[PDB]
Design a protein around this ligand. Structure first.
Ligand SMILES: [K+]
Ligand SMILES: [Mg+2]
Ligand SMILES: [Mg+2]
Ligand SMILES: [Mg+2]
Ligand SMILES: [Mg+2]
Ligand SMILES: [Mg+2]
Ligand SMILES: [Mg+2]
Ligand SMILES: [Mg+2]
Ligand SMILES: [Mg+2]
Ligand SMILES: [Mg+2]
Ligand SMILES: [Mg+2]
Ligand SMILES: [Mg+2]
Ligand SMILES: [Mg+2]
Ligand SMILES: [Mg+2]
Ligand SMILES: [Mg+2]
Ligand SMILES: [Mg+2]
Ligand SMILES: [Mg+2]
Ligand SMILES: [Mg+2]
Ligand SMILES: [Mg+2]
Ligand SMILES: [Mg+2]
Ligand SMILES: [Mg+2]
Ligand SMILES: [Mg+2]
Ligand SMILES: [Mg+2]
Ligand SMILES: [Mg+2]
Ligand SMILES: [Mg+2]
Ligand SMILES: [Mg+2]
Ligand SMILES: [Mg+2]
Ligand SMILES: [Mg+2]
Ligand SMILES: [Mg+2]
Ligand SMILES: [Mg+2]
Ligand SMILES: [Mg+2]
Ligand SMILES: [Mg+2]
Ligand SMILES: [Mg+2]
Ligand SMILES: [Mg+2]
Ligand SMILES: [Mg+2]
Ligand SMILES: [Mg+2]
Ligand SMILES: [Mg+2]
Ligand SMILES: [Mg+2]
Ligand SMILES: [Mg+2]
Ligand SMILES: [Mg+2]
Ligand SMILES: [Mg+2]
Ligand SMILES: [Mg+2]
Ligand SMILES: [Mg+2]
Ligand SMILES: [Mg+2]
Ligand SMILES: [Mg+2]
Ligand SMILES: [Mg+2]
Ligand SMILES: [Mg+2]
Ligand SMILES: [Zn+2]
Lengths: 119, 57, 192, 110, 46, 235, 45
RNA sequence: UCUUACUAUAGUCAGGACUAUAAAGGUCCGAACGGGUUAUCGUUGCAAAGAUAUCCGAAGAACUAUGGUAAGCGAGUGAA
RNA sequence: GACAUGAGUAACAAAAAAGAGUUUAAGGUACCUAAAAGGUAUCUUAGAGUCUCGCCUAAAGCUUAUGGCUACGUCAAGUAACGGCCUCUAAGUUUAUAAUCUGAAGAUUAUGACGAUGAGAAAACUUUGGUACCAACAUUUAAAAGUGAAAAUUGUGCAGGAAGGAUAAACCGUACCUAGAAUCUGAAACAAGUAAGCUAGUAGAGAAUACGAAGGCGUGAAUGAGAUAACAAUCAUAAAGGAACUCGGCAAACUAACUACCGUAACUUAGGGAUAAGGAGAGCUCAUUAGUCUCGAACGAGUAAAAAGGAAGAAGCAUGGAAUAUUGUUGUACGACUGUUUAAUUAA
RNA sequence: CUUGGCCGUUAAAUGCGGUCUUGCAUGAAUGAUGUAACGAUACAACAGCUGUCUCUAUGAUUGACUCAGUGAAAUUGGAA
RNA sequence: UAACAGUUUUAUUAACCUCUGGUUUACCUGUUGUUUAUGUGCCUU
């Protein structure tokens, strides 16, 4: 459950390390795995995104428990995302870390193909 | 209050459904025959038996 | 808005309420009878029956659980695991009896009741049933089906039963306890 | 399920008022109950206020049947149903759906 | 509003401030006694 | 913790029946002590003359008693011998117009002070068991348990009659290991001689029976100098 | 006493009159040399 | 006999810490004590100025007690 | 002035708390009994007490003041274990005297008198000016040790710390209450306020914090018994997020105390800043012991001795274990600073 | 006039800080100006923290409600 | 034919606790300080 002012760990090679959620796009309820958000970059890593940039992102794993049809429930130790463009495709080229398997049913194929492991 | 309540309206509030209900759930004690409340013990025989079991036991 | 209450709170705090029930049960096992309010007699009933169940267990956990319910255990534990354990050895539950009575305090007019240990030396239903049978024999009246039903209730699990009952009846008759009683054949003609 | 006397938050979803910023004794209260003289100088009918809640008939529509066991005498329906356990409910074919096939209606009568 | 000005008050100050000798031995005190005597007061002081 | 006794019959070490509950008399519940089997014990580690005389003071209005080793009492005796019996019942000090000597016990031996220090111990211990553990007066005699906490405390202060009875008991051999005995262990034992001086001859009758080793006299040394004449019965 | 210095181990109860009461008839805190004897009964005033 | 100032005679300030001192400081942390910062409650109140928490000073220009002096044409007292 | 209405409504909620037996007196009912009486049971009014539970506790306890519309059998030559009266004086007062000033009233100076919150021989028997002084602070001292007073000794700092007199038992006070349970002030039986001493023990540096032995209390029906809706007050916990709340982080939460621990920036009036910041340690068991202490007989043993002690060990999710001490940092304005103020809406 | 211009801080600055000034209407003991230290003064920012909020929920006590006992008040031209 | 595999989102109203969480003041377990009761309890001849 991501909302305004929530901090997330960006796990793509876009240049961002810590981003703050500014808007939940396409809905009023708090964002979960597979939802689009607008973020503001607060920390970088050392056409990369710099601190203060405003980009769109996709929640790839949350700390709130996410239930599935088969009764299984997944939970991560952090909230993470990957930056995207208004077109919907990723900005980076490689993702380091596990992502939520809920990205499959929300039409995020490109984010999954570059994801090493899914949970 | 904006006005003094009249005699008609205060009597309504005091009497309409505020009558004291008569107690009809009464019966007699099987040991002495005095009037008692239903599903209750006789207060006369209670104290008398309570004292009878205190002297000889 | 929330859930219904599990039990009566009796307008008290958690610690106070617990101590209240322990005192009612401590006084019950000490005197075999207590006269209090009906709501208190009904809350101490569930705790008194659960304490007599511990008396019928053989583990040490039960001996420590009974010690934690009474307030003078060193003085009452021998009676619990002694006289009381032998009394209710063949009775499957229902060791207590609550009987509504008139208000114990007339100031408040609070509904009162008597909590007693069945088959005990101060069983009120055992005595009331004896005074009824004593009146019937002294007045040559036929006992009702409800009197016979109670005669069997207060003599089935008792130690001697009928022998103790007939002795209570004989005592009341010799003491003239039924003197001044109203014959049931004259109840229908009395307006007071 | 009955709820007894319910306030305005539970009975109508009122938001309530603030909690710390100076609010005085009005954290769960309904606030204003209407407009001034220009609106009737009265509380209008249908005004949402505290009151009893629940213990009313409630219908859930379009619930499929997943299991049918005659020995146990149960009919397992998907979703939730109004009331507590042990309460009687009325089950009937959905009104917003087509009736069951004619071959089935006649097979049951047979 | 009124205040509790008699809190901690002592009776040694009452006799010094309003006692009989405080008045018979002064020029203005004699007037007080003579005024209260004319009115018929029993309590002329303290 | 505390352990109260019950008013049951028990044996006595004295030669008399100090109480109606006494079963037997002159019973040896323990072998003789180091000084009991000694013809002349002496004050080994005490001042010269200490123990030859023992004084008893009482409140002439309320009955509170105090035991002393010297001819005078101080504020220590009141703090250390008077327990709390209630509010307004324990005096904050000793008032000279209310406290008077009750009696003085003098032993025949003028250098056997150890005998007196023992008699003093048994007296203070008995008094402690009168103010506390008074099971013999709860339902009998004064019936202190049938009274209010106010009247009860006023009766616990009246220790004068009890104190006189303690003397007749302690001087008769009461107490385990009291030096009023004299065991020869040739085994023959006897009681030591003593003298009790009274300001009021009538006070010596609070004891139902006195031993044969005690002689009674009227007048305590020092009272005649204060112009306090003693009270005699025969006039 | 074996150890006499002030900091020595304290094993005594420093509340001497603990539980003692003349109005409640609590009894004596310890067993005395006159505790197993019947309390002498005087003649009342 | 409230209160402001002054005056006389007295009393009180757990414990710890730093500082040049054993004791030299309108020093430090913090009870008693003395204040009354903030918030809530209360507002026909328990109270015509209270309750709870929080906060400030706490060897000093400190606090407190019993007495005394100064007030009503001109103004007594006033760290105002 | 009487009597209505609101209304038989609010209120009888200091976040201590009650439960079950027993008993005395007087009186009211029912029955036994009709020779009254007495007995049994019950109720009303006014009390008492037992067992259990809880609350207060450097108090809501004990002993005493100021005071008192509570009540009058409260008893003293003096010290131990006592004040007044009486002697002496301070601040001051003075319808005393003298002198002086003054529209009268009066005022002033001196003397006298009066005036405690101070000073007053002896007793467990008794009747000059540092050769100093008895303000503060510190130190030392009744010899087994420790602790708290009294008095004295010595010293320190500047703010430089009274006066006077001497040195055979009268009269007055003495009861009760001390503010959480019937008494003082607050219009009162008010959750406020008021002086002194004592005020168990464990544990601590401590009068902090927690428990609480004794004692008292858990109110004069000025209440009691139920039920546990909304809502209010006072609290407790909380998924994910973490100021998005709001005039404003108001309120709440985080943090916290301790160690003779490590370490600590800019700047600076060189004192500070600073307990900066930021880290480490902690309870239980145990190896080990230079001296002290204990036991046995230099030596041996011992923590049923105080302490020391280690990179030792055990168990648990967790050993600042419960309670007690409310964040850190940064840039400005104003005022140097500690202080003071509109008693009771403004504390700056 | 005015949210003065510029810079920093904010995803967004009528705020805060720095800086330039033609300052309706700054100014030198009605003192001018800059630091250390101090502040329950006022303003702004960061970190942490949290039911302040997203968005409330459950639980506890006391009241609220019912029975018994006692028994007010403001108010009231008269009222179907 | 079988088998296998795939077949919207947002918002809103209401009901409902199977699941995921929150709550748990008479449930179980562990644990600190202190008090009370009961039982027990040192060495040596
Ligand atoms: K003149
Ligand atoms: Mg209630
Ligand atoms: Mg508790
Ligand atoms: Mg229900
Ligand atoms: Mg809300
Ligand atoms: Mg209209
Ligand atoms: Mg209208
Ligand atoms: Mg005024
Ligand atoms: Mg005053
Ligand atoms: Mg007195
Ligand atoms: Mg004054
Ligand atoms: Mg200071
Ligand atoms: Mg509030
Ligand atoms: Mg209000
Ligand atoms: Mg400060
Ligand atoms: Mg401080
Ligand atoms: Mg109304
Ligand atoms: Mg109401
Ligand atoms: Mg009410
Ligand atoms: Mg009667
Ligand atoms: Mg005198
Ligand atoms: Mg004089
Ligand atoms: Mg004086
Ligand atoms: Mg108080
Ligand atoms: Mg009063
Ligand atoms: Mg009061
Ligand atoms: Mg304290
Ligand atoms: Mg009291
Ligand atoms: Mg009570
Ligand atoms: Mg949360
Ligand atoms: Mg969380
Ligand atoms: Mg905002
Ligand atoms: Mg907003
Ligand atoms: Mg705050
Ligand atoms: Mg290790
Ligand atoms: Mg482990
Ligand atoms: Mg200032
Ligand atoms: Mg200041
Ligand atoms: Mg003001
Ligand atoms: Mg002030
Ligand atoms: Mg203010
Ligand atoms: Mg100038
Ligand atoms: Mg009522
Ligand atoms: Mg659920
Ligand atoms: Mg379930
Ligand atoms: Mg649950
Ligand atoms: Mg339990
Ligand atoms: Zn009957």
């Amino acid at each position: 459950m991501i909302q305004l002012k929530t901090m997330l760990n960006c796990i793509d090679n876009s240049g961002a390390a810590l981003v703050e959620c500014a808007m939940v796009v396409g809905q009023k309820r708090h964002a979960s795995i597979g939802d689009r958000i607008v973020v503001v970059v607060q920390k970088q890593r050392g056409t990369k995104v710099k601190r203060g940039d405003i980009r769109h992102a996709v929640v790839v794993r949350t700390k709130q428990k996410v239930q599935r049809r088969d009764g299984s429930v997944v939970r991560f130790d952090d909230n993470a995302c990957v930056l995207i463009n208004k077109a919907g495709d990723p900005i980076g080229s490689r993702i380091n870390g596990v992502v939520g398997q809920e990205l499959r049913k929300k039409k995020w194929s490109k984010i999954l193909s570059m994801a090493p492991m899914q949970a | 209050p904006k006005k003094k309540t009249s005699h008609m309206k205060k009597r309504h509030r005091q009497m309409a459904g505020k009558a004291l209900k008569d107690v009809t759930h009464l019966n007699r004690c099987p040991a002495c025959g005095n009037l008692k409340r239903m599903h209750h013990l006789c207060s006369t025989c209670l104290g008398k038996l309570k004292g009878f079991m205190d002297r000889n036991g | 808005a929330g859930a219904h209450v599990k039990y009566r709170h009796l307008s008290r705090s958690s610690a106070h309420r617990q101590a209240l029930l322990r005192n009612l049960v401590t006084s019950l096992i000490k005197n075999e009878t207590i006269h209090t309010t009906y709501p208190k007699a009904k809350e101490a009933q569930r705790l008194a029956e659960k304490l007599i169940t511990l008396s019928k267990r053989d583990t040490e956990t039960a001996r420590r659980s009974a010690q934690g319910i009474l307030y003078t255990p060193d003085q009452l534990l021998p009676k619990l695991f002694g006289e009381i354990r032998e009394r209710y050895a063949n009775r499957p539950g229902g060791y207590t009896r609550v009987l509504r009575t008139e208000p114990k305090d007339q100031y408040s007019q609070a509904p009162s009741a008597i909590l007693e240990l069945v088959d005990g030396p101060k069983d009120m239903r055992f005595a009331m049933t004896a005074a009824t049978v004593a009146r019937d024999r002294e007045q040559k009246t036929e006992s009702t089906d409800l009197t016979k039903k109670n005669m069997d209730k207060v003599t089935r699990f008792r130690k001697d039963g009928m022998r103790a009952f007939e002795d209570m009846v004989a005592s009341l008759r010799d003491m003239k306890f039924t003197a001044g009683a109203i014959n049931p054949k004259e109840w229908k003609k009395l307006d007071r | 399920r009955g709820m007894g006397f319910a306030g305005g938050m539970k009975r109508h979803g009122f938001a309530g008022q603030e909690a710390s910023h100076g609010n005085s004794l009005n954290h769960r209260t309904i606030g204003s109950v209407g407009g001034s003289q220009g609106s009737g100088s009265r509380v209008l009918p249908g005004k949402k206020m505290p009151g009893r809640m629940g213990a009313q008939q409630h219908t859930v529509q379009n619930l499929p049947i997943l299991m049918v066991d005659n020995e146990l005498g149960i009919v397992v329906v998907k979703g939730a149903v109004a009331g507590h356990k042990g309460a009687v409910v009325k089950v009937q074919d959905a009104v917003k759906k087509a009736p069951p096939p004619e071959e089935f209606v006649e097979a049951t009568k047979q | 509003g009124p205040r509790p000005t008699m809190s901690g008050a002592t009776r040694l100050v009452q006799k010094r401030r309003h006692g009989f000798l405080s008045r018979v031995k002064t020029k203005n005190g004699q007037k007080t006694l003579k005024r209260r005597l004319a009115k018929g007061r029993l309590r002329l002081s303290a | 913790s505390t352990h109260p006794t019950t008013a049951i019959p028990k044996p006595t070490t004295a030669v008399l029946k100090t109480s109606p509950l006494a079963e037997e008399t002159a019973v040896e519940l323990k072998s003789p002590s180091r000084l009991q089997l000694k013809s002349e014990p002496g004050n080994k580690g005490n001042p010269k003359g200490h123990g030859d005389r023992i004084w008893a003071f009482h409140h002439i209005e309320q009955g509170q008693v105090i035991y002393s080793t010297k001819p005078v009492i101080s504020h220590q005796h009141l703090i250390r011998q008077q327990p709390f019996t209630g509010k307004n019942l324990v005096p904050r000090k000793i008032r000279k117009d209310y406290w008077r000597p009750l009696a003085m016990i003098e032993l025949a031996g003028k250098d056997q002070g150890a005998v007196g220090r023992s008699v003093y111990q048994k007296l203070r211990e008995f008094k402690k068991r009168h103010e506390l553990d008074w099971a013999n007066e709860a339902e009998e005699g004064r019936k202190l348990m049938h009274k209010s906490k106010r009247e009860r405390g006023q009766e616990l202060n009246d220790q004068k009659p009890n104190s006189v009875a303690d003397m007749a008991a302690v001087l008769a051999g009461a107490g385990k290991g009291n030096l009023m005995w004299q065991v020869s262990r040739l085994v023959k034992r006897q009681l030591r001689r003593a003298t009790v001086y009274w300001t009021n001859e009538q006070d010596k009758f609070h004891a139902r029976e006195w031993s044969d080793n005690v002689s009674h006299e009227v007048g305590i040394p020092g009272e005649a100098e204060k112009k306090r004449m003693p009270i005699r019965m025969s006039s | 006493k074996r150890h006499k210095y002030p900091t020595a181990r304290v094993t005594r109860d420093n509340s001497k009159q603990r539980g003692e009461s003349a109005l409640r008839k609590s009894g004596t805190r310890w067993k005395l040399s006159v505790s197993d004897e019947p309390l002498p009964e005087p003649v009342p005033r």
